[PDB]
Amino acid sequence: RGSHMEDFVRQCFNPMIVELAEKAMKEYGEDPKIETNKFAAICTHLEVCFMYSDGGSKHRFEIIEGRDRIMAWTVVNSICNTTGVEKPKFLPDLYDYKENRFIEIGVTRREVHIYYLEKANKISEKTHIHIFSFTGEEMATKADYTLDEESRARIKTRLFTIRQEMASRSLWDSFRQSE
Ligand SMILES: O=C(NCCc1ccccc1)c1nc([C@@H]2CCCN2C(=O)COc2ccccc2Cl)[nH]c(=O)c1O
Ligand SMILES: [Mn+2]
Numbered sequence: 001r002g003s004h005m006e007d008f009v010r011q012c013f014n015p016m017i018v019e020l021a022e023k024a025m026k027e028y029g030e031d032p033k034i035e036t037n038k039f040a041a042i043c044t045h046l047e048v049c050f051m052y053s054d055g056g057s058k059h060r061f062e063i064i065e066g067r068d069r070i071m072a073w074t075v076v077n078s079i080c081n082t083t084g085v086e087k088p089k090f091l092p093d094l095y096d097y098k099e100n101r102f103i104e105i106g107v108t109r110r111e112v113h114i115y116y117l118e119k120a121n122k123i124s125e126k127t128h129i130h131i132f133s134f135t136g137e138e139m140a141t142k143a144d145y146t147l148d149e150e151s152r153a154r155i156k157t158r159l160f161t162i163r164q165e166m167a168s169r170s171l172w173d174s175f176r177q178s179e
């Protein structure tokens with residue numbers, strides 16, 4: 001069965017992102033052809049992670065998401081050993097060499113406060129938390145939004161464009177009521 005959401009994801013995100021998203025889903029035992037809403041969500045989260053790491057200086061961010069589980073933890077161990085930072089309980093998404101902290105990126109369809117709470121309660125104190133929403137809201141640990149305003153604004157704009165493209169295809173309602 002070929003869903004509209006699967007075909008939309010493929011023409012909406014660039015192929016490297018789609019490829020990385022497909023391998024992650026299969027690595028954790030889910031099918032992009034069936035779990036099509038989560039397919040879209042993982043592509044979205046991946047692109048946000050990459051845009052975020054592009055927002056700093058040259059060697060500011062180490063990218064943890066988008067790797068297979070073993071090498072992602074391998075990079076975490078190396079980061080932890082040369083900087084002396086506690087090994088996080090769960091895999092984070094980036095590491096900030098400038099502020100010397102792991103970052104967990106969040107992309108939510110619901111209101112921001114709730115997701116931050118669930119993410120904070122679930123995650124480990126040292127890891128910095130940065131949530132984006134499809135409505136333009138954001139929340140970061142200690143109100144410290146790591147990047148400058150233009151880089152985060154660009155992430156916000158893209159997320160709202162994605163929402164519009166789905167709404168134009170009558171796929172937004174199913175996506176919001178799927179998280
Ligand atoms: O890295 C994340 N998950 C690592 C894998 C994992 C798997 C199970 C438990 C804990 C961790 C992560 N997960 C999430 C959300 C909330 C926590 C679970 N979850 C998922 O999406 C789980 O499913 C997947 C995750 C990744 C690929 C494919 C699937 Cl199917 N939100 C992120 O912002 C984020 O970075
Ligand atoms: Mn992650």
Ligand SMILES: [Mn+2]
Nearest residue numbers: 093104105106
């Ligand atoms: Mn994340």
